[PDB]
Design a protein around this ligand. Structure first.
Ligand SMILES: O=C(Nc1cc(Nc2ccc3c(c2)CCc2ccc(OC[C@H](O)CO)cc2C3=O)ccc1F)c1ccccc1
Ligand SMILES: CCCCCCCCO[C@@H]1O[C@H](CO)[C@@H](O)[C@H](O)[C@H]1O
Length: 333
């Protein structure tokens, strides 16, 4: 076992192996803070995430386990991958802290697009390619948005925070539809791509109701065929007593855009999620012919999400997470 050194960083303590040097705060999220570090074994800059209160509750404990399991499973160029996982603890009894190490990207899409058609083409292409891979493990992201997309200087992109604002969320989510298909994520890609080409948030709702009014404005109120599929009297009545809008012409909306990007946006931003282009299909659209290679667009090994339906004790989630830490086998490059 390596030796750790301790350090106070923004009210939080950081205890990490000595192989990781020059720790400096990049920022903090909902469930952890992330530091930039140097990795003396590789000469590379890494991202080190310390989990905040990983076992505070049963849902936190299960959330901690979930993140570790997801991260150990992803082996793809366009999805965040695990370099290292460590804890300063010598035993299970000690176990109370988790640190995760990934490649340091240097920015998120928020930071870089605030683009040119070729930039957009390349970024969306890579998003779609990582999604194809995630979707193939029967994993749904559910919160794709620019702040979840890590991009470096070479314009290479990795999807972060993937599996389980409202500006990017599919309409079937803000209505709390029971279940979702994978193409909830295609909607979000539609919204991101739109923003990249225009400079503006496609649907900047003030809330879930406003948000929805903006979507139906671009896309049109659902017709009887989509209405056939809505059980909820609540949901269905609102829509039916609503101000019937027609579907706008996208050519008009996105005046100036590559028409091949206008066409893809048209196939992504369908209200009926059964009618949305999938990630596979999108990769083969004409907009991406200069990046698209069928034989370099991989799918994932089967992902066991059975733990998700299980209701266990904190100590059980904590101990499962520990097993995951200990069995971690690094990537060779
Ligand atoms: O993604 C899951 N877990 C997870 C997430 C992360 N998150 C990361 C990583 C890298 C980066 C960012 C966020 C943020 C964008 C960004 C901005 C500035 C920057 O450098 C600026 C500074 O000036 C350097 O010079 C670097 C980066 C960056 O590179 C890190 C480790 C993890 F483990 C997960 C997966 C599944 C389920 C739950 C969670
Ligand atoms: C009010 C505007 C939003 C209504 C249209 C969103 C419906 C999305 O589409 C629906 O998604 C469901 C999964 O969530 C599928 O099971 C349905 O087959 C599909 O029609």
């Amino acid at each position: 076992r390596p030796t750790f050194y301790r350090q106070e960083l923004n009210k939080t303590i950081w205890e990490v192996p000595e192989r990781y040097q020059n720790l400096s705060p990049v920022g903090s999220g909902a469930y952890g803070s992330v530091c930039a570090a140097f990795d003396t074994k590789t000469g590379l800059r890494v991202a080190v995430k310390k989990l905040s209160r990983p076992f505070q509750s049963i849902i936190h404990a299960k959330r901690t386990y979930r993140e570790l399991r997801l991260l150990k499973h992803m082996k793809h160029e366009n999805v965040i991958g695990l370099l290292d996982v460590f804890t300063p603890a010598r035993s299970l009894e000690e176990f109370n802290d988790v640190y995760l190490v990934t490649h340091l990207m240097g920015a998120d899409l928020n930071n870089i697009v605030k683009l040119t058609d070729d930039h957009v083409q390349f970024l969306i292409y890579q998003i779609l390619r990582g999604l194809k891979y995630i979707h193939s493990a029967d994993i749904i992201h559910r919160d794709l948005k620019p702040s979840n997309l890590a991009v470096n200087e070479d314009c290479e992109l990795k999807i972060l925070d993937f599996g389980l604002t409202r500006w990017y969320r599919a309409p079937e989510i803000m209505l709390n539809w029971m279940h979702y298909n994978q193409t909830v994520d295609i909607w979000s890609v539609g919204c991101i791509m739109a923003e990249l080409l225009t400079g503006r948030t496609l649907f900047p709702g003030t809330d879930h109701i406003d948000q929805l009014k903006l979507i139906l404005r671009l896309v049109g109120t659902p017709g009887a065929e989509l209405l056939k599929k809505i059980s909820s009297e609540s949901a269905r009545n609102y829509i039916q007593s609503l101000t019937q809008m027609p579907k706008m012409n996208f050519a008009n909306v996105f005046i100036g855009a590559n028409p091949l990007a206008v066409d893809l946006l048209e196939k992504m931003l369908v209200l009926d999620s059964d009618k949305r282009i999938t990630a596979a299909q999108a990769l083969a659209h004409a907009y991406f012919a200069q990046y698209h290679d069928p034989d370099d667009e991989p799918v994932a090994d089967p992902y066991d999400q059975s733990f998700e339906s299980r209701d266990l004790l904190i100590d059980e989630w904590k101990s499962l997470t520990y097993d995951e830490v200990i069995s971690f086998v690094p990537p060779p490059l």
